[PDB]
């Protein structure tokens, strides 16, 4: 963490400084200042212990802060989240007996590198032809966030099992959290006592609704959702579910029940689903040939999927094209020439306070030094109104 | 569409998201010294001129680096002046082993006997890695090639 460093802790620096200061202590009586000379054994031996001791001495303040964050407010040490989808199994024929797809049934994509396992046993009653069950990814990570019908290959054959396919794009793949995310998670525990501000409300609603969801709290916003008509005593919540879609009414009801015993008596709580604005990107860039065109496209797509994460986006805030260009270029190995969002080069303002961006399509036109033009197009969402 | 919700007194969804802060005394810098040596296993000596914690750790515990235990048994900062005539509690050698507590802890793999004590005694007993089995030391080197970020 960004804690001040008490003393200099470095092997080579310790050797050099220990020779120079030995020269200084005597009135120039010791002149072997050569950091790699004949005094290197003595100085290096002393500096080995010096560094292995000062390295631990420099950790005192961070150790105290970590002990505070661990003991008095236990905080789980989050490691990651596994992506989940909904598989559908379809049988070859109508059976006279009830089919059973066992727990931990392995399915995979066409490449065979991404593997999902069924949560529990699936019982398809006799006479039925299809049955759905949830599946979880093999490992944590954002690479398991696949599209619909992207997982259809299965190794173990079952009798009369015709097909299997994921009917829901797998979501909530997370490789872990950074130090600042854990800091925010710890600090919200410090200050959520009595949800009063916009921030406070949102953090509470994101809890108890899942990890990978979003909330937007607006004060004095009535049922008409018109800003110019403020209604004192009204708090409007706008929700995006764990799947990245506008919140289902059951989730709305759950969050309402959760927040009911926490709002000020006499105040009115309104909850409605959030709205999504689709972002279509067109990139014309020059490649330095340090990566292949496919590798560049994959890296840019991954960076943009990180950028347009609803956890990384503030609802109602305009999307800045310079920020998008910086996120694209942070991939490296390319030079941006032109970028279009929604058929323009200008910043995209959200229509209202509760609209979240959601980038859907991106076209690549990558040119290298030799003059090869690589053109590609990627659609990331299943449909406009998803 | 908007659903209206009004202040309730107590739901069952207030039990859903409930405790956020859990006071836990797990292993941290302020919990190294939770366990204490019994008073019956100590010696109540007096501080005399020419005395040091090195001498006390040498005579009594046979090891010069054992002084951390003695200070940890007395709550004193070693570099602070221990006045002449002040009393100290020196741990015994043979009676330091009964200050180590034995707990059977459960696990999905299986129940394990675990030794817990103040960290100074744990380091002194495990000096030279004699107590730990070779499998643990081999495991610590299973991850050998450490990934670093280029900057």
């Amino acid at each position: 963490l960004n804690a001040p460093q008490l003393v200099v802790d470095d092997y080579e620096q310790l050797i050099i400084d220990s020779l120079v200061h030995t020269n200084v202590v005597s009135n120039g009586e010791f002149t072997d200042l050569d950091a790699s000379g004949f005094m290197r054994p003595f100085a290096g031996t002393m500096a080995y212990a010096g560094s292995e001791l000062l390295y631990k001495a420099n950790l005192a303040s961070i150790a105290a802060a970590k002990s505070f964050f661990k003991n008095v407010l236990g905080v789980p040490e989050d490691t990651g989240t596994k992506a989940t989808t909904t598989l559908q199994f379809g049988l070859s024929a109508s059976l006279s007996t009830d089919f059973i797809v066992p727990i931990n049934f392995q399915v995979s994509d066409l490449s065979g590198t991404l593997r999902f396992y069924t949560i529990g046993n699936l019982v398809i009653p006799a006479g039925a032809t299809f049955g759905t069950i949830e599946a979880i990814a093999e490992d944590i990570g954002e690479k398991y966030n696949v599209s619909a019908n992207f997982i259809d290959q299965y190794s173990t054959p079952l009798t009369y099992l015709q097909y299997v396919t994921n009917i829901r794009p797998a979501t909530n793949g997370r490789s872990g959290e950074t130090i600042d995310n854990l800091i925010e998670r710890c600090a919200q525990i410090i200050r959520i006592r009595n949800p009063v501000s916009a921030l406070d409300f949102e953090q509470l609603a994101e809890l108890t609704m899942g990890e990978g969801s979003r909330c937007k709290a607006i004060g004095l916003l009535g049922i008409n959702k018109i800003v110019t008509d403020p209604q004192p005593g009204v708090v409007h919540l706008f929700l995006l579910d764990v799947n990245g879609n506008p919140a289902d009414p059951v989730t709305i009801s759950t969050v309402g029940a959760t927040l009911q015993p926490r709002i000020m008596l006499g105040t009115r709580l309104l909850i409605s689903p959030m709205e999504v604005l689709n972002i279509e990107l067109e990139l014309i860039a020059l490649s330095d040939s340090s990566k292949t065109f496919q590798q560049l496209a994959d890296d840019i797509l991954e960076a943009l999927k990180v950028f347009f994460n609803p956890a990384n986006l503030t609802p109602g805030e305009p999307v800045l094209i310079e920020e998008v260009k910086f996120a694209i270029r942070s991939v490296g190995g390319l030079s941006i020439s032109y970028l279009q969002m929604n058929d323009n080069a200008i910043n995209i303002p959200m229509p209202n306070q509760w609209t979240i961006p959601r980038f859907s399509y991106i076209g690549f036109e990558l040119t290298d030094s030799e003059g090869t033009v690589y053109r590609d197009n990627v659609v990331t969402v299943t449909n406009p109104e998803e | 569409t908007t659903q209206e919700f009004l202040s309730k007194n107590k739901t069952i969804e207030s039990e859903l998201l409930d405790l956020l802060i859990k006071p836990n005394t797990d292993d941290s810098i302020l919990t190294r010294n939770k366990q204490a040596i019994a008073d019956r296993d100590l010696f109540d000596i007096e501080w005399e001129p020419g005395q040091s914690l090195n001498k006390l750790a040498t005579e009594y515990l046979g090891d010069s680096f054992a002084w951390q235990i003695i200070a940890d048994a007395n709550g004193i900062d070693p570099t602070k002046e221990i006045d002449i005539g002040a009393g100290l509690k020196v741990p015994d050698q043979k009676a330091l082993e009964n200050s180590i507590k034995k707990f059977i802890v459960n696990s999905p793999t299986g129940k394990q006997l675990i030794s817990d004590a103040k960290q100074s005694i744990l380091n002194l007993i495990g000096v030279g890695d004699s107590n730990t089995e070779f499998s643990k030391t081999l495991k610590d080197c299973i991850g050998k090639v450490v990934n670093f970020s280029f900057d």
Binding site: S94, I124, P125, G127, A128, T129, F130, G131 | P108, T109
Partner: peptide, 29 residues
């Protein structure tokens, strides 16, 4: 003298409806 011999070991540690049915006759009663 009583002598004890113990042999011990360590275990390893960890659709809407059916398709077709025969025709039925229904009689209101």
């Amino acid at each position: 003298i009583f002598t004890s011999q113990v042999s011990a070991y360590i275990p390893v540690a960890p659709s809407q409806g059916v398709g077709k049915l025969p025709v039925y006759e229904i009689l209101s009663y």
